[PDB]
Enzyme design. Structure first.
Site, PDB file in Angstrom:
ATOM      1  N   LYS A  13       2.503   0.076  -5.062  1.00  0.00           N
ATOM      2  CA  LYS A  13       3.148  -0.840  -4.324  1.00  0.00           C
ATOM      3  C   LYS A  13       2.526  -2.507  -4.111  1.00  0.00           C
ATOM      4  O   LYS A  13       3.249  -3.343  -4.308  1.00  0.00           O
ATOM      5  CB  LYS A  13       3.666  -0.406  -3.002  1.00  0.00           C
ATOM      6  CG  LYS A  13       4.639   0.868  -3.194  1.00  0.00           C
ATOM      7  CD  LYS A  13       5.078   1.010  -1.686  1.00  0.00           C
ATOM      8  CE  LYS A  13       4.349   1.710  -0.891  1.00  0.00           C
ATOM      9  NZ  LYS A  13       3.991   3.375  -1.043  1.00  0.00           N
ATOM     10  N   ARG A  88      10.120   5.037   5.044  1.00  0.00           N
ATOM     11  CA  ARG A  88       9.713   6.143   4.159  1.00  0.00           C
ATOM     12  C   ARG A  88      10.159   7.233   4.929  1.00  0.00           C
ATOM     13  O   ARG A  88       9.580   8.589   4.529  1.00  0.00           O
ATOM     14  CB  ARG A  88       8.064   5.939   4.192  1.00  0.00           C
ATOM     15  CG  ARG A  88       7.089   5.990   5.337  1.00  0.00           C
ATOM     16  CD  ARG A  88       5.784   5.161   4.748  1.00  0.00           C
ATOM     17  NE  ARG A  88       5.297   5.885   4.037  1.00  0.00           N
ATOM     18  CZ  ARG A  88       3.964   5.388   3.283  1.00  0.00           C
ATOM     19  NH1 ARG A  88       3.746   3.921   3.440  1.00  0.00           N
ATOM     20  NH2 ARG A  88       3.444   6.117   2.452  1.00  0.00           N
ATOM     21  N   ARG A 127      -9.495   4.025  -6.578  1.00  0.00           N
ATOM     22  CA  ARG A 127      -9.419   2.868  -6.141  1.00  0.00           C
ATOM     23  C   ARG A 127     -10.557   2.056  -5.381  1.00  0.00           C
ATOM     24  O   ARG A 127     -11.139   2.718  -4.638  1.00  0.00           O
ATOM     25  CB  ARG A 127      -8.133   2.730  -5.340  1.00  0.00           C
ATOM     26  CG  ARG A 127      -7.836   1.332  -4.585  1.00  0.00           C
ATOM     27  CD  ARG A 127      -6.576   1.323  -3.989  1.00  0.00           C
ATOM     28  NE  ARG A 127      -6.295   2.350  -3.025  1.00  0.00           N
ATOM     29  CZ  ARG A 127      -5.038   2.460  -2.064  1.00  0.00           C
ATOM     30  NH1 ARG A 127      -4.262   1.420  -2.014  1.00  0.00           N
ATOM     31  NH2 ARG A 127      -5.175   3.171  -0.766  1.00  0.00           N
ATOM     32  N   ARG A 160     -10.982   2.751   0.697  1.00  0.00           N
ATOM     33  CA  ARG A 160     -10.013   3.109   1.775  1.00  0.00           C
ATOM     34  C   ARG A 160     -10.555   4.632   2.526  1.00  0.00           C
ATOM     35  O   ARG A 160     -10.741   5.346   1.476  1.00  0.00           O
ATOM     36  CB  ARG A 160      -8.807   2.795   1.410  1.00  0.00           C
ATOM     37  CG  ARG A 160      -7.974   2.256   2.740  1.00  0.00           C
ATOM     38  CD  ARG A 160      -6.619   1.675   2.279  1.00  0.00           C
ATOM     39  NE  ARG A 160      -5.879   2.863   2.311  1.00  0.00           N
ATOM     40  CZ  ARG A 160      -4.616   2.721   1.992  1.00  0.00           C
ATOM     41  NH1 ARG A 160      -4.064   1.698   1.512  1.00  0.00           N
ATOM     42  NH2 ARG A 160      -3.764   4.036   2.184  1.00  0.00           N
ATOM     43  N   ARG A 171      -1.153  13.177   2.218  1.00  0.00           N
ATOM     44  CA  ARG A 171      -0.197  12.038   2.255  1.00  0.00           C
ATOM     45  C   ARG A 171       0.622  12.068   1.083  1.00  0.00           C
ATOM     46  O   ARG A 171       1.920  11.917   1.089  1.00  0.00           O
ATOM     47  CB  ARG A 171      -1.183  10.547   1.496  1.00  0.00           C
ATOM     48  CG  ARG A 171      -2.049   9.917   2.878  1.00  0.00           C
ATOM     49  CD  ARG A 171      -3.139   9.285   2.205  1.00  0.00           C
ATOM     50  NE  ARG A 171      -2.810   8.005   1.493  1.00  0.00           N
ATOM     51  CZ  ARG A 171      -3.678   7.286   0.706  1.00  0.00           C
ATOM     52  NH1 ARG A 171      -4.790   7.593   0.688  1.00  0.00           N
ATOM     53  NH2 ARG A 171      -3.116   6.384  -0.092  1.00  0.00           N
TER      54      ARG A 171
HETATM   55  N1  LIG Z   1       0.222   0.371 -13.395  1.00  0.00           N
HETATM   56  C1  LIG Z   1      -0.941   0.844 -13.065  1.00  0.00           C
HETATM   57  N2  LIG Z   1      -1.682   1.716 -13.769  1.00  0.00           N
HETATM   58  C2  LIG Z   1      -2.817   2.292 -13.617  1.00  0.00           C
HETATM   59  N3  LIG Z   1      -3.471   1.866 -12.408  1.00  0.00           N
HETATM   60  C3  LIG Z   1      -2.716   1.307 -11.492  1.00  0.00           C
HETATM   61  C4  LIG Z   1      -1.370   0.671 -11.821  1.00  0.00           C
HETATM   62  N4  LIG Z   1      -0.821   0.079 -10.771  1.00  0.00           N
HETATM   63  C5  LIG Z   1      -1.769   0.093  -9.744  1.00  0.00           C
HETATM   64  N5  LIG Z   1      -2.985   0.790 -10.050  1.00  0.00           N
HETATM   65  C6  LIG Z   1      -4.107   0.946  -9.357  1.00  0.00           C
HETATM   66  O1  LIG Z   1      -3.986   2.224  -8.604  1.00  0.00           O
HETATM   67  C7  LIG Z   1      -4.467   2.112  -7.510  1.00  0.00           C
HETATM   68  C8  LIG Z   1      -3.502   2.135  -6.131  1.00  0.00           C
HETATM   69  O2  LIG Z   1      -2.524   0.939  -6.599  1.00  0.00           O
HETATM   70  P1  LIG Z   1      -1.943   0.314  -5.216  1.00  0.00           P
HETATM   71  O3  LIG Z   1      -1.029  -0.818  -5.605  1.00  0.00           O
HETATM   72  O4  LIG Z   1      -3.147  -0.039  -4.425  1.00  0.00           O
HETATM   73  O5  LIG Z   1      -1.114   1.296  -4.528  1.00  0.00           O
HETATM   74  P2  LIG Z   1      -0.151   1.525  -3.296  1.00  0.00           P
HETATM   75  O6  LIG Z   1       1.234   2.223  -3.844  1.00  0.00           O
HETATM   76  O7  LIG Z   1       0.007   0.125  -2.662  1.00  0.00           O
HETATM   77  O8  LIG Z   1      -0.994   2.386  -2.653  1.00  0.00           O
HETATM   78  P3  LIG Z   1      -1.038   3.000  -1.022  1.00  0.00           P
HETATM   79  O9  LIG Z   1      -2.342   3.828  -0.905  1.00  0.00           O
HETATM   80  O10 LIG Z   1      -1.575   1.710  -0.609  1.00  0.00           O
HETATM   81  O11 LIG Z   1       0.060   3.268  -0.653  1.00  0.00           O
HETATM   82  P4  LIG Z   1       0.372   4.194   0.781  1.00  0.00           P
HETATM   83  O12 LIG Z   1       1.886   4.288   0.724  1.00  0.00           O
HETATM   84  O13 LIG Z   1      -0.483   5.414   0.507  1.00  0.00           O
HETATM   85  O14 LIG Z   1      -0.115   3.886   2.000  1.00  0.00           O
HETATM   86  P5  LIG Z   1      -0.020   2.783   2.832  1.00  0.00           P
HETATM   87  O15 LIG Z   1      -1.196   1.613   2.910  1.00  0.00           O
HETATM   88  O16 LIG Z   1       1.404   2.083   2.763  1.00  0.00           O
HETATM   89  O17 LIG Z   1       0.103   3.243   4.266  1.00  0.00           O
HETATM   90  C9  LIG Z   1      -1.108   4.148   4.748  1.00  0.00           C
HETATM   91  C10 LIG Z   1      -0.888   4.697   5.869  1.00  0.00           C
HETATM   92  O18 LIG Z   1      -0.112   4.020   6.982  1.00  0.00           O
HETATM   93  C11 LIG Z   1       0.751   4.809   7.483  1.00  0.00           C
HETATM   94  N6  LIG Z   1       2.163   4.346   7.453  1.00  0.00           N
HETATM   95  C12 LIG Z   1       2.559   3.163   6.430  1.00  0.00           C
HETATM   96  N7  LIG Z   1       3.720   2.955   6.705  1.00  0.00           N
HETATM   97  C13 LIG Z   1       4.170   3.720   7.329  1.00  0.00           C
HETATM   98  C14 LIG Z   1       5.616   4.081   7.930  1.00  0.00           C
HETATM   99  N8  LIG Z   1       6.635   3.001   7.431  1.00  0.00           N
HETATM  100  N9  LIG Z   1       5.789   5.066   8.333  1.00  0.00           N
HETATM  101  C15 LIG Z   1       5.096   5.666   9.184  1.00  0.00           C
HETATM  102  N10 LIG Z   1       3.594   5.682   8.732  1.00  0.00           N
HETATM  103  C16 LIG Z   1       3.383   4.571   7.971  1.00  0.00           C
HETATM  104  C17 LIG Z   1       0.838   6.266   7.015  1.00  0.00           C
HETATM  105  O19 LIG Z   1      -0.288   7.082   7.674  1.00  0.00           O
HETATM  106  C18 LIG Z   1       0.347   6.083   5.740  1.00  0.00           C
HETATM  107  O20 LIG Z   1      -0.351   7.058   4.908  1.00  0.00           O
HETATM  108  C19 LIG Z   1      -5.263   1.075  -7.435  1.00  0.00           C
HETATM  109  O21 LIG Z   1      -6.482   1.433  -7.550  1.00  0.00           O
HETATM  110  C20 LIG Z   1      -4.509   0.182  -8.524  1.00  0.00           C
HETATM  111  O22 LIG Z   1      -5.589  -0.678  -9.081  1.00  0.00           O
HETATM  112 MG   LIG Z   2      -0.808  -0.639  -0.560  1.00  0.00          MG
END
Ligand SMILES: Nc1ncnc2c1ncn2[C@@H]1O[C@H](COP(=O)(O)OP(=O)(O)OP(=O)(O)OP(=O)(O)OP(=O)(O)OC[C@H]2O[C@@H](n3cnc4c(N)ncnc43)[C@H](O)[C@@H]2O)[C@@H](O)[C@H]1O
Ligand SMILES: [Mg+2]
Ligand SMILES: [Zn+2]
Length: 216
Positions: A13, A88, A127, A160, A171
């Protein structure tokens, strides 16, 4: 251009969103990023959210919805916005519907970046993030030119806290059971778009960008 990016933890994302914001200039609103920024500044919101985030659990709906509502009302969302990681849960989706109805900014597309759960552990444990700009890299799939430092600003990269095997697993567990209900919710609305996220970054973005033409 009112967009929502959804996908399992690590699907890409943030990576795809970074590309969208550069081409279109709409605000990248990531609830995960918002919570961590709060955790860093040690605001009451940050401390409350931390307990859930550190365990890989979802932060409660009420407080999460509250910060997104205020965020979407800012002047920078005038021409559109990019929601990342929200909603989500179906409850959050229903809440967002009312919020956007009030603001008169209904969703154009919910883009689901589909990636097999079996490869996400590798994506997250490998990552590395820039402590300065937050852009992400991957030890294998998208490494920095110089290990440990950001290609753009020279900042130090880090891993992270929640990108450890145990928390990543939680997760994936927590978000996987929320996935089908969310897909069904938006499919019924008629604006769900599925993108194959298991290809090179620019190939994935090519399909994502194909959905963005004509949105102002
Ligand atoms: N095409 C490709 N091929 C190969 N490699 C690739 C690639 N594209 C990318 N990559 C690589 O892959 C890796 C990941 O890519 P990256 O782009 O970093 O991935 P992402 O989908 O953004 O991953 P996140 O970990 O950031 O998502 P998340 O939903 O788990 O947690 P979030 O921060 O939103 O949320 C964290 C926490 O916040 C809380 N939270 C957030 N939102 C809510 C909500 N709405 N409600 C309740 N709790 C919430 C929860 O506790 C949650 O767990 C990188 O190393 C990148 O280089
Ligand atoms: Mg992210
Ligand atoms: Zn950087």
């Amino acid at each position: 251009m009112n967009l929502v990016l959804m996908g399992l933890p690590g699907a890409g994302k943030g990576t795809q969103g970074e590309r969208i914001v550069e081409d279109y200039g709409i605000p990248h609103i990531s609830t995960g990023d918002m919570f961590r920024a709060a955790m860093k500044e040690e605001t009451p919101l940050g401390l409350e959210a931390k307990s859930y985030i550190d365990k890989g659990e979802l932060v409660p709906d009420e407080v999460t919805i509250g910060i997104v509502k205020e965020r979407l009302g800012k002047d920078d969302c005038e021409r559109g916005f990019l929601l990342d990681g929200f909603p989500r849960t179906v409850a959050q989706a229903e809440a967002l519907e009312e919020i956007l109805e009030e603001y008169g900014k209904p969703i154009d597309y919910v883009i689901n970046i589909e990636v097999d759960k079996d490869v996400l552990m590798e994506r997250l444990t490998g990552r590395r993030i820039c402590s300065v700009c937050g852009t992400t890299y991957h030890l294998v799939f998208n490494p920095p030119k110089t290990p440990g430092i950001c290609d753009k600003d020279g900042g130090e990269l880090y891993q992270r806290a929640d990108d450890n095997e145990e928390t990543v697993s939680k997760r994936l567990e927590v978000n996987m059971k929320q996935t089908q209900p969310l897909l069904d919710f938006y499919s019924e609305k008629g604006y769900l778009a599925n993108v194959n996220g298991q290809r090179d970054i620019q190939d994935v973005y090519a399909d994502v960008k194909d959905l963005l033409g004509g949105l102002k």
